[PDB]
Amino acid sequence: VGATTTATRLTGWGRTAPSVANVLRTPDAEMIVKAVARVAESGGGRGAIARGLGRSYGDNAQNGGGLVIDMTPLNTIHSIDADTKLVDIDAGVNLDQLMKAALPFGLWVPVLPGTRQVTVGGAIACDIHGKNHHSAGSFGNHVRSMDLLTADGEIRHLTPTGEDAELFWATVGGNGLTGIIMRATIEMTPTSTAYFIADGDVTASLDETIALHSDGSEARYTYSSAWFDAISAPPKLGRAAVSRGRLATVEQLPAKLRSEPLKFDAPQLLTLPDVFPNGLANKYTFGPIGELWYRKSGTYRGKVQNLTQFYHPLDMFGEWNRAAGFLQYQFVIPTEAVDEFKKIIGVIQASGHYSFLNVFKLFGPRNQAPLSFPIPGWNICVDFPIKDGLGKFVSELDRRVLEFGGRLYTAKDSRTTAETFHAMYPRVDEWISVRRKVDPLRVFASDMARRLELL
Numbered sequence: 001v002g003a004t005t006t007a008t009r010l011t012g013w014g015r016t017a018p019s020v021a022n023v024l025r026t027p028d029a030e031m032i033v034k035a036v037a038r039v040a041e042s043g044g045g046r047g048a049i050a051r052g053l054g055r056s057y058g059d060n061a062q063n064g065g066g067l068v069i070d071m072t073p074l075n076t077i078h079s080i081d082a083d084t085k086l087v088d089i090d091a092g093v094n095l096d097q098l099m100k101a102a103l104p105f106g107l108w109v110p111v112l113p114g115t116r117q118v119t120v121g122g123a124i125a126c127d128i129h130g131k132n133h134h135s136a137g138s139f140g141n142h143v144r145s146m147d148l149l150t151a152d153g154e155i156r157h158l159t160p161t162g163e164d165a166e167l168f169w170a171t172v173g174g175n176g177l178t179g180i181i182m183r184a185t186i187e188m189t190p191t192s193t194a195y196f197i198a199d200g201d202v203t204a205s206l207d208e209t210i211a212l213h214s215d216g217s218e219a220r221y222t223y224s225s226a227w228f229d230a231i232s233a234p235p236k237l238g239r240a241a242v243s244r245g246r247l248a249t250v251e252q253l254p255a256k257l258r259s260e261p262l263k264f265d266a267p268q269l270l271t272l273p274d275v276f277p278n279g280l281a282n283k284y285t286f287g288p289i290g291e292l293w294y295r296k297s298g299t300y301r302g303k304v305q306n307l308t309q310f311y312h313p314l315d316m317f318g319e320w321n322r323a324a325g326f327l328q329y330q331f332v333i334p335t336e337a338v339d340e341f342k343k344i345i346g347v348i349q350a351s352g353h354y355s356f357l358n359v360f361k362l363f364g365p366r367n368q369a370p371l372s373f374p375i376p377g378w379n380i381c382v383d384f385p386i387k388d389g390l391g392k393f394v395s396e397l398d399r400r401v402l403e404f405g406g407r408l409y410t411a412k413d414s415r416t417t418a419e420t421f422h423a424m425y426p427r428v429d430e431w432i433s434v435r436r437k438v439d440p441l442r443v444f445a446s447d448m449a450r451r452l453e454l455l
Ligand SMILES: Cc1cc2nc3c(=O)[nH]c(=O)nc-3n(C[C@H](O)[C@H](O)[C@H](O)COP(=O)(O)OP(=O)(O)OC[C@H]3O[C@@H](n4cnc5c(N)ncnc54)[C@H](O)[C@@H]3O)c2cc1C
Pocket: 013, 049, 050, 051, 052, 053, 054, 055, 056, 057, 060, 061, 071, 091, 092, 112, 113, 114, 115, 117, 118, 119, 120, 121, 122, 123, 125, 126, 127, 128, 129, 130, 131, 174, 175, 176, 177, 179, 180, 181, 182, 411, 412
């Protein structure tokens, strides 16, 4: 299939801040190189940015009045090796495609986000994190090389420790602003099964949620995350359903499943909105029997689960989740600032803004990428319905997050200011200097670049 350059109205996943750009779409690498050579001959214009599957909520994969390059047609898996654990894939392959192709080799995608519909390029450019951050770091940690199409029209082969480690690490979490990742080699995690052994716990309050994450139990699990109550007044505020686990070995599987330990099950036809259309509430739900039931069902040990059960637990709730019109907000607060983190949770609950879907986890050590989002500490994602006062309230949350040494995530943001973002990322000047060195003419530009003064 040939090249196609179309004027397209683009938004992130949040369906907000739309802007019109020329979308180039081609499986031909030579053609992508030529477009970048074209933009650069100009050589100052409104530039270009790569786009993956558009799963970022904000404006990092759009470029109003300029060019956008859709990378999804470059989706070749070149090789997978079980012995070296390395995969060599085009930047356009997505993590679901990769997971499925790698399982028969006993290989596991080392960092999986809450949706598998993300490209390798998008996973690198946002240095994405998953349920295992505290044990495996973020996506960038597992990249062994990548080929970066730079502004000068050349393709630079980058490694994390080689000659241009600096450019490598500016590209990790760089939001497409150092060039176009064409291709990458990733080191996979070995596995004997496609299953998890999981322990579930239900806490009664915010204080309990924090204690559970601070009692040392986190180190017994490679994977850990929680669903968090952000609407109930204290003491119920910040109670959580915690899901922790690790990949199962074949010995740990029931005999029924040992025949095909690496098998991935197809997603079921029926979801919970399908079997129970008008909700799951009864007369017991919100009283003491409801609390007991919820606590009992969410407390367990050594439960064998496939990926969907362990890792995408709310796929069950199907049509019920988020029912556009929502603002996604994710931040992390450094571990030591526990009181400050608790204070921010209190602010949210008293705001008059109600988020039903709240993902909580304790991040581990950060990496050397100057713009990487994750830092060790308390991470949470909340989802606010758009309504009066919200924009001004999230600006107040920004101030609180900043003051308490934390940051927002670019993959979620469409509204923070440049001033706020720069203070949240003290290594931003260091990063900008790398960018100016590798792209003096601003061949690469995006709506986010301009909003956040990263240009
Ligand atoms: C339901 C849902 C759940 C999510 N859960 C998580 C989670 O648990 N953890 C997490 O970290 N994130 C999560 N995300 C965010 C998502 O993982 C990131 O936004 C990711 O970057 C999206 O990948 P994409 O291919 O859709 O990239 P896009 O949104 O299309 O692009 C994002 C950025 O990547 C850059 N980029 C894309 N391809 C290339 C390339 N080839 N070369 C250079 N730059 C490139 C773009 O220019 C842009 O700056 C979630 C998103 C959704 C919608």
